[PDB]
């Protein structure tokens, strides 16, 4: 059944709640973002209201088909009505079209949902500097100390010399980028600017990285992968086998791959600094591992939240063990007594 973390009180609301059926009671339903585990169950088949981004809206349409008359796109930073309700939608800082919610309850109470984010500080000078909020539903994905990553852009940085490095010595060296979701686009989009080429892909990838109000994307993407040196495959296809079998395909054009494996958090960033990154290589393939995560740090999380001042915090990510559970309400004791909320 649906959960409690996935309903609004006061409302008719639910957010991100789409593999439920008829979640009795729901009269609009929110999108924070066009990720699957987040819009598991939409199709052409749905008729309730669903409220969103622009972008998530143009991804709806076109990739999933779901029919106009029930896209309800709504701009950022704006104050709208939404079933006798005030709502505004805020950028969560985590892939194209992402956003938090805010819910102006009618007797007072004021919700953020952050959906998926990377919190920054640059949240605490938008509409949310201006009232207080009360209840705060929290991407909790990393909230444990271990995980601490680099900034986006100290990775873009290495992910740019390395690739400009590895083709200027080799000019016949391929630069392969995985993907299995949007997010994540500066890491393809960076190195093939360095390159002075267009990132070569699927007419699947091309369909859906055309739907994310991306400026100049017609020069920077294209589906002839003959006429472009940085190609898009699949994650899963990102390992020796795929790749000598990539390989194989380009006809003699390339004899080297630098492939880029752009992951979340692994157990590496614990000793490793991004200046000493090194790949796994076998041939001439090499594969490099990189942290760039479109979800907060701990410490990025722990400074909003210290920031923010909920009165009550409701995790939605790692809520399926009571271990998990026990240790995030143990660190949201320690922020408040630390910062004295
Ligand atoms: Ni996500």
Same mark, same amino acid.
Not at 1 to 6: D, G, I
Not at 278 to 281: E, K, L, M, R
Not at 299 to 303: A, D, Q
């Given at each position: 059944? $649906?959960?409690?973390?996935?309903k609004?009180?006061?409302?008719?609301?639910?957010?991100?709640?789409f593999?439920?059926?008829?979640?009795?009671?729901?009269?609009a339903?929110?999108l924070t973002?066009?990720?699957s585990?987040?819009?598991?169950?939409? @199709?052409?088949?749905?008729?309730?209201?669903?409220?969103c @981004?622009?972008?998530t809206?143009?991804?709806? #349409?076109?990739?999933?088909?779901?029919?106009?008359?029930?896209?309800?796109?709504?701009?950022? /930073?704006?104050?709208?009505?939404?079933?006798?309700?005030?709502?505004?939608?805020?950028?969560?800082?985590?892939?194209?079209?992402?956003?938090?919610?805010?819910?102006?309850?009618?007797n007072?109470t004021?919700?953020?949902?952050?959906?998926?984010?990377?919190?920054?500080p640059?949240?605490?000078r @938008?509409?949310?500097?201006? =009232?207080?909020?009360?209840?705060?539903?929290l991407?909790?994905?990393? $909230?444990?100390?271990?995980?601490?990553?680099?900034? *986006?852009?100290?990775?873009?940085?290495?992910?740019?010399?390395? %690739?400009?490095? %590895?083709?200027?010595?080799?000019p016949?060296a391929?630069?392969?980028?995985?993907?299995?979701? +949007?997010? #994540?686009?500066?890491?393809?989009? %960076?190195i093939?600017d360095?390159?002075? @080429? #267009?990132?070569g892909?699927? *007419?699947?990838?091309?369909?859906?990285?055309?739907?994310?109000?991306?400026?100049?994307?017609?020069?920077?993407?294209?589906? /002839?992968? $003959?006429?472009?040196?940085?190609?898009?495959?699949?994650?899963?296809?990102?390992?020796? #086998?795929?790749? *000598?079998?990539?390989?194989?395909? $380009?006809?003699?054009?390339?004899?080297?791959?630098?492939?880029?494996?752009?992951?979340?958090?692994?157990?590496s960033?614990?000793?490793?600094?991004?200046? /000493?990154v090194?790949? *796994?290589?076998k041939?001439?393939?090499? +594969?490099?591992?990189?942290?760039?995560?479109?979800?907060?740090?701990y410490?990025?999380?722990?400074?909003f939240?210290q920031?923010?001042?909920? =009165?009550?915090?409701?995790?939605?990510?790692?809520?399926?063990?009571?271990?998990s559970?026990s240790?995030?309400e143990?660190?949201?004791?320690?922020?408040?007594?630390? %910062?004295?909320?």
């Open positions: 059944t $649906c959960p409690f973390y996935k609004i009180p006061g409302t008719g609301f639910t957010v991100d709640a593999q439920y059926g008829v979640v009795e009671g729901c009269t339903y929110f973002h066009f990720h585990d987040h819009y598991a169950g939409l @199709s052409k088949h749905f008729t309730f209201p669903v409220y @981004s622009e972008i809206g143009n991804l709806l #349409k076109n990739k999933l088909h779901v029919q106009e008359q029930y896209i309800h796109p709504l701009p950022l /930073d704006t104050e709208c009505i939404v079933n006798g309700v005030k709502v505004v939608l805020l950028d969560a800082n985590h892939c194209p079209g992402a956003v938090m919610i805010l819910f102006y309850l009618p007072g004021v919700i953020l949902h952050t959906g998926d984010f990377r919190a920054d640059s949240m605490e @938008s509409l949310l500097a201006d =009232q207080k909020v009360h209840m705060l539903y991407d909790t994905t990393y $909230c444990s100390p271990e995980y601490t990553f680099p900034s *986006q852009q100290e990775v873009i940085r290495f992910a740019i010399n390395t %690739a400009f490095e %590895a083709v200027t010595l080799n016949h391929l630069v392969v980028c995985g993907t299995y979701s +949007i997010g #994540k686009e500066k890491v393809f989009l %960076a093939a360095v390159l002075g @080429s #267009k990132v892909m699927s *007419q699947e990838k091309y369909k859906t990285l055309q739907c994310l109000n991306i400026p100049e994307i017609n020069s920077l993407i294209t589906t /002839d992968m $003959c006429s472009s040196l940085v190609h898009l495959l699949p994650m899963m296809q990102i390992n020796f #086998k795929g790749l *000598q079998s990539h390989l194989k395909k $380009c006809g003699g054009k390339y004899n080297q791959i630098l492939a880029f494996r752009p992951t979340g958090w692994t157990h960033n614990k000793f490793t600094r991004i200046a /000493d090194i790949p *796994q290589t041939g001439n393939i090499s +594969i490099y591992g990189i942290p760039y995560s479109e979800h907060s740090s410490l990025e999380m722990k400074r939240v920031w923010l001042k909920p =009165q009550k915090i409701i995790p939605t990510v790692n809520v399926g063990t009571w271990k559970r240790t995030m143990k660190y949201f004791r320690e922020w408040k007594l630390e %910062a004295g909320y």
